[model samples]
Target: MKFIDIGINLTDPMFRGIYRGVQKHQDDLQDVIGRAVEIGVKKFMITGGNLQDSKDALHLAQTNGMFFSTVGCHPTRCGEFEKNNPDLYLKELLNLAENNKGKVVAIGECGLDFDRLQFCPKDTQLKYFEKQFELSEQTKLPMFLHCRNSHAEFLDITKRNRDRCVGGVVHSFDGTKEAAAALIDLDLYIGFNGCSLKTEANLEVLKSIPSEKLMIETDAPWCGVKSTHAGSKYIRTAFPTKKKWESGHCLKDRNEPCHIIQILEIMSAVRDEDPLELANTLYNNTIKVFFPV
Candidate 1:
């Protein structure tokens, strides 16, 4: 059966190259996307990081026939868009999304990231997060959420805005059944990654989340399954710019969207479900929610 990587950073330094970088690199987006297809990831959702990354995501989707994309600012770098002038960014984001029209699916990888605020400040992160949340509401696009060390804050903000939440996915979710159920109650999807399977706490949560609410990703160039001398597997093959730079703790050489099968295998065993069936469920659910295709 085929699978979909709902959230992959094709524009990151370690994965698909963006036009901004491609102008210097040359047709990098097509190469990474070709590799992803080679690995059996039939459909992929390219998520953006900051304002610049969002623009690059739009360009990639508009130019590449192989993948779809979403446009939004990441919480960590929300500082660039000026939370006070969010519509300025939103106006531009939607314009880009409109260019993709049928191809641009969802509006995220966009959500709260209080974890980064330790270096910045919680209030600052929250303020920025609030700005993006408003965009999600205005666009009525399902989100690709990223919630780390600040689960409670993420929950609070999302819950408070539940009224406007058409639906979204809490990508890389590491919260309790209560949190999972909370998001589901508000009609949000829960995205699980290879990293989430590394610990029992997260594993239990992953297994507990229903297939309808489940989604998967590699978050590549950063997280992965296998190791290539202790680096992100996607670092070299998908991201040439990052090839020279040594990889970090990310499991190098083993981070392929195809290996999402491994994650499906683990979830099937723990949840006492069939791997093929579970994978098919997730595959269809993703397309149904994220794109018509």
Candidate 2:
């Protein structure tokens, strides 16, 4: 079945040219996307971590037929808003979301990242997160959420704002089954990637995710499944299988959208569902969330 990468960093410079002194994926973004499509990844949601990145993501989505984008700041980068006319930043994000309509699918990649408090203080992240929540309320679009070690606060705020919000997906989920139930009760979708399936317990969490509320993403350039990933055999069978970077050795350190099939493979393995059924359900859920129009 065809797939949609609910999250991918297609514009990340890593895939644009040489990265960390090593050749990576031929240095061209289109070729990277072409390879992904070759492997059945049909659409992508370019993640935006801040204002500039959000605009860049929108531009990419508007220009690419198979692309869409999320418009907001990541919690770690909330400091960018803290320093300047913060409401101005908030207003622009809201305006961009308003103006773009369907092209801007969600109001975030935003939420709390208490795991890295050093990057941005909790209060700072909270302040901006609340502002983006307000944007979600105003724009009536889904929220593309991220939370790490801040579930209490994350759930608190989301619960508080659940009425005004349209809907959202807690992408890259790594929380308790209780947490998943709570978000589902609040009408939120749970997104999974390689990171979500890193452990057997996580597989149990995966089971708790109902087919309708479950979605998948690559969160590429960062969260690809490794050689140690649970579904090594299935991943290898998925097309565009990891290739040796050079004669040195075989490793898939870099993530591309093509690797998303590996996620579907693992999900089917753990969830005990047919691959085609799972892929169709996920693709339909993604469209429901981001392409409701």
Point to the candidate with the largest TM-score: 2
In candidate 1, what are the lDDT values of residues 36-122, reduced to their tens digit? 676567877778766667777767666656577777767777665665476687677767665656666777656676667744466
lDDT string for model 2 (1-293, tens) is 78989889887877665667776545556667877887788779999889899999998888788899889999999998856689888888888889988678888999998889999999998888887878888888899999899999999989988887889899999899999999999999999988887776788889888999999998888887766655454564444334544322223577778778888888998888999999999999988987887
Q: Count the backbone clashes (under 3 Å) in each candidate.
A: 5, 0
Please give the distance, in angstroms, between residue 158's alpha carbon in candidate 2 and its true position after superposition: 0.2
Query: Model 1 — which ten-residue stretch has the worst lDDT?
Result: 228-237
lDDT of 2 at 20: 77
Positional deviation of 168 in candidate 1, in angstroms? 0.8
User: What's model 2's overall lDDT?
Assistant: 0.84
Q: List the residue pairs that clash in candidate 1.
A: 228-252, 231-252, 232-252, 233-252, 233-253
Give the alpha-carbon lDDT of every model: 0.67, 0.84
Q: Which stretches of candidate 2 lie over 4 Å from their true place?
A: 20-25, 230-251
* Candidate No. with top lDDT: 2
